[PDB]
Amino acid sequence: ANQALLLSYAVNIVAALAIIIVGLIIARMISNAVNRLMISRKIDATVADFLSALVRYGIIAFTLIAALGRVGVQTASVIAVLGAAGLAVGLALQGSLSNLAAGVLLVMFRPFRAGEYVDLGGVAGTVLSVQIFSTTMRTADGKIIVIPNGKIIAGNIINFSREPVRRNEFIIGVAYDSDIDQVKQILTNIIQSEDRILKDREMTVRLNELGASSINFVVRVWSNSGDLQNVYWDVLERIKREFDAAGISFPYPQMDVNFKR
Template sequence: METELLNTDVINNMQSWIVNNQGLLIEYAVNITAALLTLIIGFMVAKMLTGGLNRLLRRKIDSTIADFITSLIKYVILAFVIIAALGRVGVQTASFVAVVGAAGLAIGLALQGSLSNFAAGILLIAFRPFKAGDYIEAAGTAGTVNSVQIFTTVLMTPDNRMIVVPNSNVLNGNIINYSKEKTRRIDLVIGVSYSADLKKTKEVLTRIINEDNRILKEPECRIAVGELGASSVDFVLRPWVQADDYWNTRFDLLERIKNELDANGIGIPFPQMDVHLFKKEADGQLRRQDVA
């Protein structure tokens, strides 16, 4: 009986509080709804605005710079949207900004790596050692540049893997840009037997180079004996090609050189090992055994 009376009193008190504070509840509900709408609409506007701006900038400037600028603008807009939403639910934004500013030093110390990546991203955009679409080697990896984000550089490998590299790692290491120049040199080392006719070998290699239309006439291809190795005479071939033709030309040259050298009876040595077996006889002497 006492429990039923207690429950009845609680319900009555709640109903009374709701009736007395109806206006306040309605105000809170409106503010919360407005804050949610502010967040949703703000995020949608940020996405649409930066998407349209990115397409516009790509027509005027390099896509790498366009992606970086629009990413930065997007995060700035989202920060204002969140502050506006907090203000709508009654949070004093002035105090909030002051607290964020006061905590900025601590956050900056805690996020030194992120801040260095941000600064490195700005420097990469400013000095432009590469652009979107370039094939580069940096920070111990290689791939085609997809974009430079605020904190990271995105690379795509030839087998379609995405590699995300911190900007500071890219900037602080060596950057090799294979796409910067229009032409590239192919460096090949072809080893032939010591018994091979060097003059004939050079004629065969020269003919192969001259018959490939992808190889540029200028600069002239260098064909010469580069080294007298342990088991071979090593020729160096250094033809120049357009950067886009580099890999296909290299693969085709290696295949044709092998076929042409075989057709002309020019041997290509390969490592060999002679194994000798010895058997210890009863008298303690070692006797060599022939292996069939």
């Protein structure tokens, strides 16, 4: 009938029972509070139940191994296996968390905004919204593309509508017999007659290369980002009309045939 060690053992076992009971009731309270909060807002039944079950099971495991440790059973192996499971689930959630962090960065720094034409890794379209995990944009064709934010933060972000002024690049191919001065002066007159082409920017009309069947002139003109395509179409049509009127010919693929026998 020991009085010191037996009393210590009784204190330990009563403390372990109190620990497990308090852990059970605290897990119940936490689960009830989480269920109340998930009821207070929009949530999915299956995911909410899975999350509450995982939280409750985690708390129950914590209090059970705490009670075992208070009793005197070593729980280092259980802690190691729990750490392994936590590392596995962290590696599993690495992709989702990286997308979330990238979305936070995109919201903060604002590389692009809603209604702003962009090019995120080869796909281009008007941005509609930037969610936490992925942005959604509508292409010029009309289809909706959802791009994860991690793949947006990684790689370049071309922004077409950030700069108010953009440049067109015409590549006109005329025959070798065509007069260089006449071609240059016709193209210069066409560029000057246009009103939506900015005159304070560079207006290049130069002979760019000597091709296989034609000499390729290059025309580079700057215009406001909203008139770029219309200017391109109008200038191309006027180039064709004036070249046809002036006798300048666009050559077909040339070929020299050395006839034998």
